[PDB]
Design a protein around this ligand. Structure first.
Ligand SMILES: Nc1nc2c(ncn2[C@@H]2O[C@H](COP(=O)(O)OP(=O)(O)OP(=O)(O)O)[C@@H](O)[C@H]2O)c(=O)[nH]1
Ligand SMILES: Nc1nc2c(ncn2[C@@H]2O[C@H](COP(=O)(O)OP(=O)(O)OP(=O)(O)O)[C@@H](O)[C@H]2O)c(=O)[nH]1
Ligand SMILES: Nc1nc2c(ncn2[C@@H]2O[C@H](COP(=O)(O)OP(=O)(O)OP(=O)(O)O)[C@@H](O)[C@H]2O)c(=O)[nH]1
Ligand SMILES: Nc1nc2c(ncn2[C@@H]2O[C@H](COP(=O)(O)OP(=O)(O)OP(=O)(O)O)[C@@H](O)[C@H]2O)c(=O)[nH]1
Ligand SMILES: [Mg+2]
Ligand SMILES: [Mg+2]
Ligand SMILES: [Mg+2]
Ligand SMILES: [Mg+2]
Lengths: 435, 131, 429, 435, 429
């Protein structure tokens, strides 16, 4: 009865969406061909049910390079997706924000908007959009900015959550990452209700340490991110002792218009062998999810002060021990809140234990926790990205490409000043003041 | 930076319960009658201010705390003061707040040793500092 | 989708090109007769990028071979693997350019270029969505350079919004194959810089050293020499030909590798390179590929990077791998070798991974590096050209075939100008 | 309800711990895999019962060389221990105190403390730590001095019992034993509540004479030492007519803060065949345990005076004959007490007869005694060790290894005078005083 | 874990090394082809310490064989057990050093070390956690002592915090294999003392005495001698390769055996040593193993300990044995033989026990003793060098390759200084 739609942009978005939709089909008991052998409706929130028993997802896969979309088309999930939904271009943006936002991206935006509009008018209780995109990728960044602008123009006030991929401090795959990230942050700072932030290096370290895999290809990272997304959406999809919604997340996590960059964490992430020798109590899973090294963004919250926290437990969970563990955590020494947030925890409980994908690295668990923390430690990441951008731009590198694809240096200057203002606001709000 | 000291088993150095209360009362000029009344942490926060000027915003703490929730906020300020000076003694805040003799006596026993190590002999009037 | 047009000029281009299409056909499982005989359907998913569909499942390639003498053309036609090229594309002249600039760019090349452009235009219109051109030539000879430059200028006018690559062969430092090398090279590079996107400068004797020592070959013939160039010349393309976990194409590489319009001269590389005997004692794994790739010894250009600094570097991995180590070791390589890396370009490494290993190998890689060390390569060539030109030697017929001494003034000035900026950015802070 | 954790450091600790934890599983009826076929709980003091029927021990195995830990991993007790608990380094300390305390140990100390805090916070009524470390080794001495400094800071006032291995007078496996032993005692003197002393030379004679075994490998010695450890904590796990706790040991044996070096003793120790011809009464095993030849440290108690004792019976023991037997022991002229200790006996009776491990040398016995005598006769052991250290240090032999690994020549002098302070402290209070 | 890099120089190092890797392969059950054929899984638990895992479960040794002449390399490659070494490690020169210090350290050795160092670094990078190096050479020859010393200095500069052992073959007193022996020996020891960790001097005729008398062999070839040496050089490192009741490694031995930085010259020993005929009349037991070790007759160095005192003594047992007799009898040995033991080092015995017996024996042992009788070896060598240098004989051959007479002043002065400390500590109270 409540429907939210998801837009996956770029190769990273498409791969993450493939993993996430595999997880959803496993969770709701839908066969890959679309048929099927708390639960009754549930699948109505994601899977639109057609005349026959077939269910089709509410997804819009959009890309400019056709390789990954063709791979998905010929993949095992071929009969599921609506063939008109998969929108592909002809040439990629080539890590060029100008190409993906001005030159090329303007030739497919109308078709993408038409498909979005048809899907929205199909539903009757539309709740929000979930945008899966990266930051370094040219098409991801450019088309994300274009879609934010167009969707904000079309639908006035709706929840628009994003699941980005912040560039790692040391690990790097591209070279124009600072330009792309600065530009995209300046453009879509205004048109986003709440953006969840994920980094690849931290997930690498988590998979290496906690799960103990020495061969962690991109599939494992995609599975972890998909698990986090499903844990976020489980409150809408399933009944529970205390339900939360997208508007609840947004309201409880964003205190100021500019400060809407929380970071996510999942627990427990343990292998099969280590599962038997562990008792998996609510208190210890809270402690593990709140431990500094388990955070999925490469930054230590100890360096800053927490601003808001959202805990979501799912499974055989008792609110009494939940509240006892949260009180203990608040009493603990590492967690230090800001002076103007006397209450700093929003708690949700769900009655559906998490499901395990087959062949996956994680083990079956009867209790799961997803933690969304809005804090100050992200200021160091913003400052590092700003420093990289300034160092690269001091002598006008690649600016010839960017300008040749229909841009001007005035845009770079405005993005730089906007990022500086955002960092200053973040630090000033985080720091204490007298009276 | 501040120097640290441990306390496991020492002879002829531990003080009597009566003398420990006299030292707390004499240093701050107040009328604590039981040592277990030190659950508030108001005296504990004043001790850090005396040891190191600044390092603690004495305006944040309040000395009229009488509730279970009020007791915790006083200790959270002391938690930040410990970190800033770089000390590494974990306060068992879950156990001091209950106001029992056992845990409250052991913490002040440790704090007395910490007081002597980082005292330069300076003096002032806490009455104007408190008000 | 994103088809690539291949143009071969000169004797080197034809000999390199003839060995090149051997590898591509093997990769896609195309019989020399021209019919598909492969097994996996992934090869036929993207076959239009290089090959062209025809009646009765024929796959003639999108290649254009041009030369001024029938000696090279007759060899590829009569020899093996010559039954699949389209005879229309076999454009040849009558007499060779004679290792002359003007005889390859003005006089003899004038009539041949008009015929070629009609074949190129016909191929381009048959294309669905053009991606770019690929040209293989030599910078020392007359036919390979005289018209290859002429072809570059004419094609650039017709399709300004396209990306084309020139896999030239830089003249050898030690022994010169042709007596008048500097006149042909200097007059050529001044033309390439103006209207080309990225050039993969390779060297002859730099391949002699690699094959003799690393590959342990006593008698390196041109068949084994051109085989090395083919592998590194097909690795750069294979990212878009096959599905991968982090795709790339011609345009994606150019954006990262070319910080400034003039600075687009690269140095290729390949790995692994092992002898027939010594392949049984090495564990084929990522840690040893990166070490073999980054050492100055295993470099296909007569340039040692230790005297220069890597501006930007891209590695195009192949085969199946876990990308924890793919990006873990490049961080380790960057930190340990931070001395030879520029400081005002942070995290200057681009990495792409495919999912189809080359034939007879579990995993491989290709390394393209835009380095400052090329500064000395143009300095040496300009040094030879200046000495020869001062005495006014060998140009009594360069001027006699249309050109003039006025033309040389800009060519030498442009070359010296380019190396000034190339050196200046190395010391810039 | 009562929990105590054990830390095994070095090869000596791990090898002893491998034999000791074999005994506890036998006593509580725990299969090696973890399942199971006075008891209602009992095992909760040592075995943390997990979600399934499996029980996992509360042990932390730490070593720098991976040679011996790997043997435990592949051994018959492979499924019992928690895989994360077994902590290993990369290279050993090589009989160097400085390496295992300054250079190599410091890089792994943080990881060990992480697992200790995780296990301590899981439990609720923690009493104390049991440390099984040697004295001559590098990691068994240098590293174990690091754990005491770290543990004492984190937990203020808790019991810390050491089951050390004193270097033998004539038998000597290593050559720098005086350098390591002198340095360890000066550092861990202030952070140990009660350290039990066991010497390898004295146990060889006990196994050769009483047990009548001519092939006493290190496996046989560790079984005999393990029975002492079990009797110390036998009162926590089992009921009895007169119980003792971990704290009661600490208060009854240590008259002065420096003088906390008792020595253990076990009785009866007889073979299988000699068992039938012995009636094994309470009045004689008390006599047997007091014989000078049965003491587990190579020193005769006849040369000194007893300061305090502690008996611990178990089995079919009736308190009337226990008190009658001790009265006869007191009036015997071989046992002489100090003047200022008119009361010199502490008793404890348990109802659990000791069990026997299969294949063991000891026979089934319905009665047992464990004696912890704090006597002045141990002052001879300090004097002998101080003689060796002073002999080699005069010409500065072997010092260049210690100095170059993060130590100073000045540090040796401080540890030398400290042992001189303890040596005359031990004598000046065991000797009589005027008035 | 704790991998060991093995380096062999000279003809003796290759001949000793050839017999060494025969024993290790037998111990770990490695077929000559290079594939595991063993039975017990305990051998593969620690196989990376010496061997290196490669593709298809093939194991290759971590050895680097280097020599100035191709005579030794050709024999090991063509002969049996030559199919497992990596051909890259087979580094060799073209002309021998000619039994000259300078020709092996300055002139001919300069070219080889640059190539060898790159192979060492490549091997060390492949290592997980390096433990140390092992070098087997000769102190009398040219390349074995010349380049071996150069290798020691270069490696020491790159890996300072590592422990490496040199198993040199000390020159023999009565019979001299090369005429100019003292010049090479004295000029080498002055370098080893500076930058080596721990060295086992092994004599030649002392092996003849052991083989002829104890083993009762009429015609001991070099195969029988090298077999005897290999057992000691395998018993030292067998503690960290196999599980044991009381483990030890390379570092543990160095701490106990080396009281002072300059006093790190040892004398090895092995037991039991019985002929084929007389093995049936003796029962293998600990009482006789220890007796066979401490007697001056069974020692690998031609220096009788009765003329000196044992500073410190190690003993690395093997096989299965009761720990009581291991400690019971060493005390009995110490008390009865207390005359030849230093007084200011009490309990000067170190003992380790393993749990895997050597091939074809129930139990064995290895005795390493840092004694004072080594003094008499250096006194004899210095005496010969001083007399020869006084007449300025053969010196005009060393000066022609870089060296000078000034360099010799410290070499002899250092040797005389070292023997002064060695004497002074024996009589010190
Ligand atoms: N977490 C995660 N990140 C990915 C994955 N695949 C790609 N990425 C990220 O995507 C970035 C590359 O840019 P993309 O967003 O993929 O851009 P593109 O889809 O190739 O299209 P262009 O920008 O035109 O090249 C890399 O920096 C990666 O961090 C993935 O499977 N999982
Ligand atoms: N890689 C490679 N390069 C070659 C080979 N053969 C020749 N070359 C190079 O290519 C150049 C050949 O000259 P071309 O440019 O082809 O000129 P041409 O074909 O002889 O015709 P003219 O210029 O008129 O003489 C020589 O300078 C060589 O350096 C080859 O087999 N492989
Ligand atoms: N009782 C008993 N003592 C042992 C046993 N194994 C070793 N030891 C003692 O341990 C000493 C050897 O040094 P360790 O404490 O083991 O040192 P380590 O654990 O090997 O670590 P490193 O010092 O770095 O080599 C010997 O002197 C023995 O007294 C054993 O199985 N039982
Ligand atoms: N143990 C042992 N020693 C040997 C054997 N063969 C030779 N030696 C010793 O090693 C020395 C050989 O000289 P090397 O150092 O190898 O010199 P080289 O390899 O001949 O090269 P040049 O010094 O240039 O002559 C001789 O002096 C012998 O004393 C052997 O088979 N076993
Ligand atoms: Mg892309
Ligand atoms: Mg030609
Ligand atoms: Mg050890
Ligand atoms: Mg030779």
């Amino acid at each position: 009865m409540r429907e939210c739609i998801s837009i996956h942009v770029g190769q990273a978005g498409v791969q993450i969406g493939n993993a996430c939709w595999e997880l959803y089909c496993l969770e709701h008991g839908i066969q890959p061909d679309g048929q099927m052998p708390h639960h009754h409706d549930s699948f109505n929130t994601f899977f639109s049910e057609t005349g026959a028993g077939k269910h089709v997802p509410r997804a819009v896969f959009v890309d400019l390079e056709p390789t990954v979309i063709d791979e998905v088309r010929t993949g095992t999930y071929r009969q599921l997706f609506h063939p008109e939904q998969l929108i592909t271009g002809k040439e990629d943006a080539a890590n060029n924000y100008a190409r993906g936002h001005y030159t090329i991206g303007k030739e497919i935006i109308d078709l993408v908007l038409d498909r979005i509009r048809k899907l929205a008018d199909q539903c009757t209780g539309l709740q929000g959009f979930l945008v899966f995109h990266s930051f370094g990728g040219g098409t991801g960044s450019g088309f994300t900015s274009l879609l934010m602008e167009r969707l904000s123009v079309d639908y006035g006030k709706k929840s628009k959550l994003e699941f980005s991929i912040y560039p790692a401090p040391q690990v790097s795959t591209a070279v124009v990452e600072p330009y792309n990230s600065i530009l995209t942050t300046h453009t879509t700072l205004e048109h986003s209700d709440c953006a969840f932030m994920v980094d690849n290096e931290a997930i690498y370290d988590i998979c290496r340490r906690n799960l103990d895999i020495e061969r962690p290809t991109y599939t494992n990272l995609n599975r972890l991110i998909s698990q986090i997304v499903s844990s976020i959406t489980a409150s809408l999809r399933f009944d529970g002792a205390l339900n939360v919604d997208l508007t609840q997340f947004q309201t409880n996590l964003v205190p100021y218009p500019r400060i809407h960059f929380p970071l996510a964490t999942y627990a427990p992430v343990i292998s099969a062998e280590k599962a038997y020798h562990e008792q998996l109590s609510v208190a210890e899973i809270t402690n593990a999810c709140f431990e500094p090294a388990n955070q999925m963004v490469k930054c230590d919250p100890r360096h800053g002060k927490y601003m808001a926290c959202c805990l979501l437990y799912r499974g055989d969970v008792v609110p009494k021990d939940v509240n006892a563990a949260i009180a203990t955590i608040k009493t603990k020494r590492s967690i230090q809140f800001v002076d103007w947030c006397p209450t700093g925890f929003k708690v949700g409980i769900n009655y559906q234990p998490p499901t395990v994908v087959p062949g996956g690295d994680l083990a079956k668990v009867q209790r799961a926790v997803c933690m969304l923390s809005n804090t100050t430690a992200i200021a160091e990441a913003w400052a590092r990205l700003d420093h990289k951008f300034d160092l690269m731009y001091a002598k006008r590198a690649f600016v010839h490409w960017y300008v040749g694809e229909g841009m001007e240096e005035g845009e770079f200057s405005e993005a730089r000043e906007d990022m500086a203002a955002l960092e200053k606001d973040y630090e000033e709000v985080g720091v204490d003041s007298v009276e | 930076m501040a120097v640290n000291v441990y306390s496991t088993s020492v002879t002829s150095e531990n003080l009597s319960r009566h003398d420990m209360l006299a030292w707390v009362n004499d240093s701050l000029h107040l009328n604590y009658t039981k040592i277990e009344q030190l659950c508030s942490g108001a005296a504990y926060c004043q001790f850090m201010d005396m040891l190191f000027p600044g390092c603690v915003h004495l305006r944040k703490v309040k000395f009229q705390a009488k509730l279970e929730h009020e007791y915790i906020h006083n200790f959270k300020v002391l938690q930040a003061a410990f970190k800033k000076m770089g000390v590494d003694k974990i306060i068992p805040v879950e156990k001091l707040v209950k106001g029992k003799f056992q845990d409250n006596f052991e913490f002040i026993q440790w704090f007395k040793k910490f007081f002597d190590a980082n005292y330069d002999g300076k003096d002032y009037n806490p009455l104007l500092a408190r008000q | 989708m994103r088809e690539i047009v291949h143009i071969q000029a000169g004797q080197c281009g034809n000999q390199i090109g003839a060995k090149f299409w051997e590898v591509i056909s093997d990769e896609h499982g195309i019989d020399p007769s021209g019919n598909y005989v492969g097994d996996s359907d992934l090869q036929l998913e993207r076959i239009s990028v290089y090959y062209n569909e025809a009646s009765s499942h024929k796959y003639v390639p999108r290649a254009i071979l041009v030369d001024l003498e029938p000696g090279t053309m007759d060899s590829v036609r009569s020899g093996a693997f010559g039954h699949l090229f389209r005879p229309d594309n076999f454009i040849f002249g009558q007499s060779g350019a004679g290792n002359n600039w003007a005889k390859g760019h003005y006089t003899e090349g004038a009539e041949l270029v008009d015929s070629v452009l009609d074949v190129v235009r016909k191929e381009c219109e048959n294309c669905d969505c053009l991606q770019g051109f690929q040209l293989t030539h030599s910078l020392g000879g007359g036919t390979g350079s005289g018209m290859g430059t002429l072809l570059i200028s004419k094609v650039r006018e017709e399709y300004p919004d396209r990306i084309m690559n020139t896999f030239s062969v830089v003249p050898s430092p030690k022994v010169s194959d042709t007596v008048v090398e500097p006149y042909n090279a200097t007059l050529s590079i001044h033309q390439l810089v103006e209207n080309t996107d990225e050039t993969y400068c390779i060297d002859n004797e730099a391949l002699y050293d690699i094959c003799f020592r690393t590959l342990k070959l006593a008698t390196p013939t041109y068949g084994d020499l051109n085989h090395l160039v083919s592998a590194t010349m097909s690795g750069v393309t294979t990212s878009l030909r096959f599905p991968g976990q982090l795709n790339a194409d011609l345009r994606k590489l150019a954006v990262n590798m070319v910080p400034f319009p003039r600075l687009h001269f690269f140095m290729p590389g390949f790995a692994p390179l092992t002898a027939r005997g010594s392949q049984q004692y090495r564990a084929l794994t990522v840690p040893e590929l990166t070490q073999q790739m980054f050492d100055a010894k295993n470099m296909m250009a007569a340039c040692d990077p230790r005297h220069g600094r890597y501006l930007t570097v891209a590695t195009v991995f192949r085969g199946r791998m876990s990308m924890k180590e793919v990006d873990e070791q490049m961080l380790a390589i960057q930190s340990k070798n931070s001395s030879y890396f520029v400081e005002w370009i942070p995290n200057n490494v681009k990495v792409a991974v495919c999912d189809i290993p080359p034939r007879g190998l579990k995993m491989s890689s290709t390394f393209i590096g835009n380095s400052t060390a090329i500064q000395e390569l143009f300095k040496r060539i300009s040094e030879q050209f200046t000495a020869m030109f001062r005495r006014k030697a060998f140009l009594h017929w360069y001027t006699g075939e249309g050109m003039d001494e006025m033309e040389f003034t800009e060519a030498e000035s442009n070359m010296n100008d380019l190396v000034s900026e190339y050196q200046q950015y190395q010391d810039a802070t």
